[PDB]
Amino acid sequence: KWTYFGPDGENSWSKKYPSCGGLLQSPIDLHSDILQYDASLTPLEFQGYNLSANKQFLLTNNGHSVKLNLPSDMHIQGLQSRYSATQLHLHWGNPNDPHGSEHTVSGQHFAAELHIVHYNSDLYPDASTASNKSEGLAVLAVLIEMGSFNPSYDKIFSHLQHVKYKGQEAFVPGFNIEELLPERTAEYYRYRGSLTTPPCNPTVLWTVFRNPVQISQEQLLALETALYCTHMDDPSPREMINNFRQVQKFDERLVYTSFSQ
Amino acid sequence: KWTYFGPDGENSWSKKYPSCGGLLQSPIDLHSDILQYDASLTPLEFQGYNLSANKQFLLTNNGHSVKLNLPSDMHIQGLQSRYSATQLHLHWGNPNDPHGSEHTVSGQHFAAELHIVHYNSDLYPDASTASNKSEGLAVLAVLIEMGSFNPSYDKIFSHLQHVKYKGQEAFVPGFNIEELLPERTAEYYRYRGSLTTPPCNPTVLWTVFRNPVQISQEQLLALETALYCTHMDDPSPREMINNFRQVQKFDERLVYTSFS
Ligand SMILES: NS(=O)(=O)c1c(F)c(F)c(S(=O)(=O)CCO)c(N[C@H]2CCc3ccccc32)c1F
Ligand SMILES: NS(=O)(=O)c1c(F)c(F)c(S(=O)(=O)CCO)c(N[C@H]2CCc3ccccc32)c1F
Ligand SMILES: [Zn+2]
Ligand SMILES: [Zn+2]
């Protein structure tokens, strides 16, 4: 029953999940002293991201997150193995402090953050298996700032009032997930880190795009007010707010960039 | 035994020291959204800070930071109770990322940070006893940036090579500790928080001065490279670097400022 607030919050995770106190932890602050240009970081290609509108995909509130399941024919090409999609989810703040990205940039939080989780499907038959293995997971991260209304993100947000409580599931028609990515996807930060929730496995190759996307104040307010960590019938409801982890020590790591300036 | 790096680092402090996972944890980012002017916050008076140059004060490396012992006649006046000095110490990063303050300002780290710890001597006999009690401690924090050479900080830093390893100790002749405080000490942030090291008791009234001080690039590099966490005969030595805690969540709370 880990949480992001109170006795069971982040400084206590490592009591039950030892990797959360181990090395290579994410998220981190992306700042100049630890950035190094790497010309071998060539463009990723996003394959089968255009999910058919006539198909539908499962949206679930598991109490800690809201995730959309993605099909294994969706993949990223460019890495040293194929990585297939398994799910996407978000992280965000609260109505009175809409600053809940996980990674920060020169010490500043963005409003929210989208993660698209993939696993090495060349080597493993499912993401759970991959998650304990060296470079088993690759997660793409999109920074989200308060700005213009975003119709593509709204294809997800329009379904949240239907997965308002833990254990609830809804179906989302397919759309082109590439619409959720920012401009100039060839410009990104890359680093070795971990899951940012229990069990904090240090098995993730992170790609954080350099450019943020925008969603509106009203979309952030919906996202921040729609969802609960607890079941529909729980007599001690908890809102699902401020579901991001603080940034972590670097432990001598660098972050490699595909952009030189 | 706790450290700042590896399996014994900050995220595992709460196993042995449960307050590190509880309420009112420090340090925090001081940013505009959470700042509120409070006209009640008047200037502190630093009494007994001009330490006898005929007295010596113990500097020790405890494996976590370098600390100078301070005398109980040194005190802050201006708070509801008298708070008497017990020790000062510093936190810093490393020469590849030289930004190791504990508090940040609009998400930005300073080079380093000086803390002068005090305890409520009106209510408790010594800082150890106060440290887990209501209203027990008060810490002053000075932000440090690279700039001009600082003679006064050099009164401490010139002794660092004598306290290189864990368990080593040196003597520092009294000097005026107020020389380590910045300009316009009436300007400060105040908030209720905790120790930033085990046992992380939530018993600290924090005062962080608005203005930083300067030390030279050579002085900052000395601080970053002079000390180890380990004993002299340890086959696996460890540099004392990056001895600062990551900022904590601070939600539905204000930091009060003595300035607008
Ligand atoms: N920010 S993040 O990308 O690190 C990240 C999460 F933020 C997050 F919430 C979840 S979870 O499964 O919904 C919560 C745990 O129950 C996962 N899922 C993890 C749990 C273990 C596992 C195994 C295979 C694929 C994904 C995950 C996750 F990878
Ligand atoms: N950043 S800080 O101001 O919170 C702070 C420290 F950063 C730090 F390193 C120390 S310590 O004594 O050197 C190491 C054991 O905590 C202390 N000392 C505290 C620990 C408990 C205690 C008891 C009596 C006097 C001082 C302290 C500390 F208050
Ligand atoms: Zn995530
Ligand atoms: Zn300190």
Curated annotation (Swiss-Prot), chain B:
Residues linked to a glycan: N50, N132
Key words of the record: Cell membrane, Disease variant, Disulfide bond, Glycoprotein, Lyase, Membrane, Metal-binding, Signal, Transmembrane, Transmembrane helix, Zinc
Family membership noted in the UniProt record: Belongs to the alpha-carbonic anhydrase family.
Binding site for Zn(2+): H89, H91, H115
Subcellular location: Membrane; Cell membrane
Topology of the protein relative to the lipid bilayer: Single-pass type I membrane protein
Tissue: Highly expressed in colon, kidney, prostate, intestine and activated lymphocytes. Expressed at much higher levels in the renal cell cancers than in surrounding normal kidney tissue. Moderately expressed in pancreas, ovary and testis. Expressed in sweat glands and bronchiolar epithelium.
The name this protein goes by in its record: Carbonic anhydrase 12
EC number in record: 4.2.1.1
Subunit structure of this chain's protein: Homodimer.
Main location: membrane
Cellular component, GO, one term: apical plasma membrane
Taxonomic placement: Eukaryota, Metazoa, Chordata, Craniata, Vertebrata
Annotated GO MF terms: carbonate dehydratase activity; zinc ion binding
Binding-site residues for substrate, renumbered to this chain: T196, T197
Function recorded in the entry: Reversible hydration of carbon dioxide.
Organism: Homo sapiens
Biological process, per Gene Ontology: chloride ion homeostasis; estrous cycle
